[PDB]
Write an enzyme that holds these catalytic residues in place. Structure first.
Site, PDB file in Angstrom:
ATOM      1  CG  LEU A  48     -20.020  -7.696 -56.575  1.00 53.29           C
ATOM      2  CD1 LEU A  48     -18.546  -7.816 -56.245  1.00 53.29           C
ATOM      3  CD2 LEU A  48     -20.581  -9.051 -56.971  1.00 53.29           C
ATOM      4  N   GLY A  49     -22.819  -5.146 -53.922  1.00 50.43           N
ATOM      5  CA  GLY A  49     -23.435  -4.688 -52.691  1.00 50.43           C
ATOM      6  C   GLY A  49     -23.476  -3.176 -52.602  1.00 50.43           C
ATOM      7  N   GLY A  54     -21.178   3.455 -49.666  1.00 50.05           N
ATOM      8  CA  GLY A  54     -21.128   3.565 -51.114  1.00 50.05           C
ATOM      9  C   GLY A  54     -21.600   2.289 -51.789  1.00 50.05           C
ATOM     10  CD  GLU A  55     -23.447   2.659 -56.052  1.00 49.54           C
ATOM     11  OE1 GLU A  55     -22.662   3.506 -56.533  1.00 49.54           O
ATOM     12  OE2 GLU A  55     -24.530   2.354 -56.595  1.00 49.54           O
ATOM     13  CE  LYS A  71     -15.244  -0.116 -48.958  1.00 49.56           C
ATOM     14  NZ  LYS A  71     -13.955   0.267 -49.597  1.00 49.56           N
ATOM     15  CG  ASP A 165     -17.659  -4.808 -38.885  1.00 50.24           C
ATOM     16  OD1 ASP A 165     -18.543  -5.143 -38.065  1.00 50.24           O
ATOM     17  OD2 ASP A 165     -17.918  -4.316 -40.002  1.00 50.24           O
ATOM     18  CG  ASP A 183     -15.823  -4.693 -44.453  1.00 49.09           C
ATOM     19  OD1 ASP A 183     -15.592  -3.591 -44.990  1.00 49.09           O
ATOM     20  OD2 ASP A 183     -16.760  -4.874 -43.646  1.00 49.09           O
TER      21      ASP A 183
HETATM   22  C1  8X7 Z   1     -13.649  -3.776 -50.681  1.00 48.39           C
HETATM   23  C2  8X7 Z   1     -14.750  -4.477 -50.978  1.00 48.39           C
HETATM   24  C3  8X7 Z   1     -15.301  -5.509 -50.121  1.00 48.39           C
HETATM   25  N1  8X7 Z   1     -15.423  -6.702 -50.927  1.00 48.39           N
HETATM   26  C4  8X7 Z   1     -14.327  -7.378 -51.378  1.00 48.39           C
HETATM   27  O1  8X7 Z   1     -13.129  -7.021 -51.105  1.00 48.39           O
HETATM   28  C5  8X7 Z   1     -14.832  -8.457 -52.142  1.00 48.39           C
HETATM   29  C6  8X7 Z   1     -14.242  -9.509 -52.855  1.00 48.39           C
HETATM   30  N2  8X7 Z   1     -15.066 -10.392 -53.480  1.00 48.39           N
HETATM   31  C7  8X7 Z   1     -16.419 -10.292 -53.436  1.00 48.39           C
HETATM   32  N3  8X7 Z   1     -17.149 -11.232 -54.095  1.00 48.39           N
HETATM   33  C8  8X7 Z   1     -18.511 -11.342 -54.178  1.00 48.39           C
HETATM   34  C9  8X7 Z   1     -19.002 -12.171 -55.200  1.00 48.39           C
HETATM   35  C10 8X7 Z   1     -20.380 -12.358 -55.382  1.00 48.39           C
HETATM   36  C11 8X7 Z   1     -21.348 -11.727 -54.556  1.00 48.39           C
HETATM   37  N4  8X7 Z   1     -22.726 -11.918 -54.749  1.00 48.39           N
HETATM   38  C12 8X7 Z   1     -23.311 -12.612 -55.891  1.00 48.39           C
HETATM   39  C13 8X7 Z   1     -24.476 -11.779 -56.498  1.00 48.39           C
HETATM   40  N5  8X7 Z   1     -25.484 -11.451 -55.443  1.00 48.39           N
HETATM   41  C14 8X7 Z   1     -26.667 -10.710 -55.954  1.00 48.39           C
HETATM   42  C15 8X7 Z   1     -24.857 -10.777 -54.271  1.00 48.39           C
HETATM   43  C16 8X7 Z   1     -23.714 -11.658 -53.712  1.00 48.39           C
HETATM   44  C17 8X7 Z   1     -20.827 -10.891 -53.530  1.00 48.39           C
HETATM   45  C18 8X7 Z   1     -19.452 -10.703 -53.345  1.00 48.39           C
HETATM   46  N6  8X7 Z   1     -16.964  -9.259 -52.738  1.00 48.39           N
HETATM   47  C19 8X7 Z   1     -16.201  -8.351 -52.100  1.00 48.39           C
HETATM   48  N7  8X7 Z   1     -16.539  -7.272 -51.370  1.00 48.39           N
HETATM   49  C20 8X7 Z   1     -17.847  -6.953 -51.129  1.00 48.39           C
HETATM   50  C21 8X7 Z   1     -18.922  -7.144 -52.026  1.00 48.39           C
HETATM   51  C22 8X7 Z   1     -20.222  -6.792 -51.618  1.00 48.39           C
HETATM   52  C23 8X7 Z   1     -20.450  -6.282 -50.329  1.00 48.39           C
HETATM   53  C24 8X7 Z   1     -19.358  -6.127 -49.449  1.00 48.39           C
HETATM   54  C25 8X7 Z   1     -19.482  -5.585 -48.066  1.00 48.39           C
HETATM   55  C26 8X7 Z   1     -18.579  -6.413 -47.107  1.00 48.39           C
HETATM   56  C27 8X7 Z   1     -19.053  -4.093 -48.010  1.00 48.39           C
HETATM   57  O2  8X7 Z   1     -20.832  -5.679 -47.599  1.00 48.39           O
HETATM   58  N8  8X7 Z   1     -18.130  -6.475 -49.902  1.00 48.39           N
END
Ligand code: 8X7
Length: 293
Positions: A48-49, A54-55, A71, A165, A183
């Site tokens: 996702l990111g 990290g990742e 994460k 943040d 986050d």
């Molecule tokens: C502890 C982890 C932080 N975090 C969460 O708690 C969390 C919960 N849900 C999600 N959902 C989510 C769903 C889809 C996408 N994407 C769809 C596919 N794309 C290529 C990228 C964007 C993206 C997310 N995403 C979540 N997190 C998440 C996911 C990616 C990046 C980041 C930060 C805030 C660290 O940059 N956080």
């Protein structure tokens, strides 16, 4: 602490509110097999990111078959302070607890010096959404995002917590127009660890009073103010320079904000008040007729 004698490991549940079951178990997981609990207990679907932290992966749990976000920290803890810092995110996440506008933490564990944080899988961040949209978000939606995130901030601030943040990248979409704040890695509890303890959020969304080490719940309102400005106007915010200073002087650039309704502009002005003592509270904003129900 860096002056203590704890300087110089298979899975262990991280919790500041749990039980003797620090031991993890799951379908697919055998402790005697060399693979980590994360590898054995989850299907890894996508990344996702990623970043210095990290990742984050989208995963399906072998426990219940549901989707989650995990994460995973970049590398083994540098030492006790590094560890305490990263583990604090779990404690932060727990103090928030269960609130409909905050990302729920399912579980957390450490193995081989790596920290894993499993949260509910929400939709994409507002940043990702705006990027996919390729333009300003309709105000109808923005009013909804503003209100939900204000409800989350009201919750945090009631318990004397400051997120520090808030930004488009960590407000995640829910079904039917909702969204959730997440986050919680930089979140501080005011009046706890008074000698410390802030690190600083993204400079684009930083409240002006923070330059002087002065922080309070008001800093989050300002951050959200600029968050909404960015997504509502499709506006790139400066990291510094003249433009950075201007946004913290009550100035709203006409060449991006002319498309705002008077009612939304009016609300942003209250949130972007440079003096934190005059800046509106989340509770006070939610009391306005334009943000209720
Ligand atoms: C502890 C982890 C932080 N975090 C969460 O708690 C969390 C919960 N849900 C999600 N959902 C989510 C769903 C889809 C996408 N994407 C769809 C596919 N794309 C290529 C990228 C964007 C993206 C997310 N995403 C979540 N997190 C998440 C996911 C990616 C990046 C980041 C930060 C805030 C660290 O940059 N956080």
């Amino acid at each position: 602490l860096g002056t203590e004698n704890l300087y110089f490991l298979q899975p262990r549940r991280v919790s500041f509110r749990g039980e003797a079951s620090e031991t993890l178990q799951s379908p697919g997981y055998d402790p005697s097999r060399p693979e980590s609990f994360f590898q054995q207990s989850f299907q890894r679907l996508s990344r996702l990111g990623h970043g210095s932290y990290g990742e984050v992966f989208k995963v399906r749990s072998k426990e219940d078959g549901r989707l989650y976000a995990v994460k995973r920290s970049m590398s083994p803890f540098r030492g006790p302070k590094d560890r305490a810092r990263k583990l604090a995110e779990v404690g932060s996440h727990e103090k928030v607890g269960q609130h409909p506008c905050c990302v729920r933490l399912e579980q957390a564990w450490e193995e081989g010096g790596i920290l894993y944080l499993q949260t509910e899988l929400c939709g994409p961040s507002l940043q990702q959404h705006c990027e996919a949209w390729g333009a300003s978000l309709p105000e109808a939606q923005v009013w909804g995002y503003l209100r939900d995130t204000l409800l989350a901030l009201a919750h945090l601030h009631s318990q004397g917590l400051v997120h520090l943040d808030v930004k488009p990248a960590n407000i995640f979409l829910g079904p039917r127009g909702r969204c959730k704040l997440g986050d919680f890695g930089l979140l501080v509890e005011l009046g706890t660890a008074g000698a410390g303890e802030v690190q600083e959020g993204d400079p684009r969304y930083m409240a002006p009073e923070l330059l002087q080490g002065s922080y309070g719940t008001a800093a989050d309102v300002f951050s959200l103010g600029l968050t909404i400005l960015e997504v509502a106007c499709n506006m790139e915010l400066p990291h510094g320079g003249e433009g950075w200073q201007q946004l913290r002087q009550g100035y709203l650039p006409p060449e991006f904000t002319a498309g705002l309704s008077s009612e939304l502009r009016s609300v942003l002005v209250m949130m972007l008040e440079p003096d934190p003592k005059l800046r509106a509270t989340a509770e006070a904003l939610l009391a306005l007729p334009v943000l209720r129900q």
